Amino acid sequence: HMVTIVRIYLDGVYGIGKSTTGRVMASAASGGSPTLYFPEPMAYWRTLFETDVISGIYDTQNRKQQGNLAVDDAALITAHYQSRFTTPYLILHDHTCTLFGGNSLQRGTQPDLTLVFDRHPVASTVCFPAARYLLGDMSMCALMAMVATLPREPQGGNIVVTTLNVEEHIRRLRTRARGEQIDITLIATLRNVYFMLVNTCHFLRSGRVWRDGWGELPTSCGAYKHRATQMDAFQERVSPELGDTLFALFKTQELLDDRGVILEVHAWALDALMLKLRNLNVFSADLSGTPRQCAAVVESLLPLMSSTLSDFDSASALERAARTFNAEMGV
Amino acid sequence: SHMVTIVRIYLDGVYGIGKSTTGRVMASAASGGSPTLYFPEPMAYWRTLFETDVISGIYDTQNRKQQGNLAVDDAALITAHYQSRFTTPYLILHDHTCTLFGGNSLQRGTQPDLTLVFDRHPVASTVCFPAARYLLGDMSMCALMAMVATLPREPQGGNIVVTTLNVEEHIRRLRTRARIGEQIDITLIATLRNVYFMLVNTCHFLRSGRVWRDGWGELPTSCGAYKHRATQMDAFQERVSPELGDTLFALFKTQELLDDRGVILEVHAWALDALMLKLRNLNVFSADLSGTPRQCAAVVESLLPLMSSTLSDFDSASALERAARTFNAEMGV
């Protein structure tokens, strides 16, 4: 008994609908075949240790403004809690990775098993870090630090970057939290970072590498940074330029030598990013309709996705991992 | 298509023991053996390549701790951030060289076509130093987990040699560099020494073919006492037949990671699994450096019969030679 598994990482900017979405896809209410959902590791972040890292992050963007903590220092304290967000993702990823199996193909069929992970390690190792850096809240050096910890995606992974029109995105961000300030720049920049990420996988699928069109590309400075904070600045592109992708932000003096050439060690890092994101078959989804509709939109690009071949012990082991994960990541 | 036999060695252990000097000799042709490339410590990355020198910073933040001007709360957060900054260049190097070692790792008891000495394995900055900072109360168990998790998986064929030294001689050396009213910081040194014994014992335990679970639920729930004892000099040693108590696993049995029943949470057992898996491709050895640089170089060398080799190709071997040349340039001073 071999099993055909398809794994989906649902990802994108927060407050868009994605968690409702996967949670619906998982629930017995959608039909199709067995669908297991791995939720966000909330408990890990909030209750399992003395410090609640979400409550800590913003607590520091407050302090840094409230004229009470060195601006230099909140860039370190925040860098740190950004690190803490990654941990449970890396643990999950380590545990699940042996079990997905091999023989990744686009089979066209329905799989015996469907997994939906709420977010891929890329979100908290590259994307959120990249955004905090563009906002000046975190240094290049520190972005490097985090990007370096992204694990290699094994074969057959599928990442669906969820999207939404801005209007509606603001409506759903008020319905959830008010009192506290929403942070419209973080949202604007994250929207851009996620487009950049999507562009990046399309870039790689098109067979290019980060060196291609690197010389031509302009150095990326205050001007380029600020632009990533503006809304709509970037968008999905099936044939992107280098500058439409995540690599563009790494061309800065910080990483360049006396004559404008990127250091070999830094090229190595850009190399590793490109390696790690390569087994990630990229898709988009607009989360405009109702949770049930959103679900069927994700479920509709199932025939396009990458399936693996697993043995019946591991299937079982993933389902156990599913049960446990939902259980302990509780609240 | 031409087949090259590589053996890689990670020299590791407590700082100030002689390891970097040893490695430079193993590289030097005068020490015979097989051609040796030596990847040094990523100094430049840490100190010069960015606006902040992680070595200055770190201690400058332990200083503002005792010396009122910055919170005790923040120190264990800025210090952790800096500990994380130490690991970056090692992860980068690891990612660059890993896909070049090739496979077929088989302890072949002969001299290899070539030898790579890396100064330190990712384990040093993602497990060992973090573990010691936690045992000293400078860092939380949760911060620890945030770093333990970022150990990369060692591929087949990795050999790690934990360097050792009697305490007299080790201290002597420490004062030999340093110089002029600089404090040493025995406290850390003592804990790091214990952590590295825990590590040699850990991989033994694991090669033995034991898992972290064997003997777990009968092991004393480690907390207050255990932390003191980890910081006490020579509390730990290289055990011949190590048990769970002697290993790095012991320190993760704390209230912080159990439920109301005294049972480790499953997500925590997973983190424990990961670490056990990565620590399974490292062939572990210990080497003593009381001899002279040459003697030391020979002590590590004589082990080679015991070490494991991978088969790479000529074009890969030749990129390692560049890799080593590049790393050496970009990291000096």
Ligand SMILES: Cc1cn([C@H]2C[C@H](O)[C@@H](COP(=O)(O)OP(=O)(O)OP(=O)(O)OP(=O)(O)OP(=O)(O)OC[C@H]3O[C@@H](n4cnc5c(N)ncnc54)[C@H](O)[C@@H]3O)O2)c(=O)[nH]c1=O
């Ligand atoms: C990963 C990461 C996160 N964070 C920070 C950023 C955030 O401030 C915070 C929590 O981030 P979270 O992702 O853990 O949890 P949420 O804040 O809940 O954001 P989500 O990731 O869950 O976004 P979703 O949009 O997937 O969440 P969801 O709850 O589905 O959507 C929010 C609201 O929209 C409505 N909704 C959902 N679907 C809807 C639909 N189809 N129609 C109408 N409304 C819909 C629901 O009523 C819900 O109230 O953590 C970091 O700082 N660094 C990091 O690396």
Ligand SMILES: Cc1cn([C@H]2C[C@H](O)[C@@H](COP(=O)(O)OP(=O)(O)OP(=O)(O)OP(=O)(O)OP(=O)(O)OC[C@H]3O[C@@H](n4cnc5c(N)ncnc54)[C@H](O)[C@@H]3O)O2)c(=O)[nH]c1=O
């Ligand atoms: C990796 C890491 C480092 N740090 C911090 C802790 C430390 O304070 C600092 C040093 O970082 P480093 O280890 O790159 O720099 P060093 O302090 O130089 O330590 P080494 O790695 O070089 O240790 P070694 O023992 O290899 O250094 P070495 O210079 O070889 O030895 C010290 C002295 O002993 C003499 N010596 C060497 N071999 C000798 C021999 N055989 N006989 C007699 N003397 C010998 C040498 O002349 C030298 O002066 O960085 C962290 O906080 N966290 C981390 O994760």
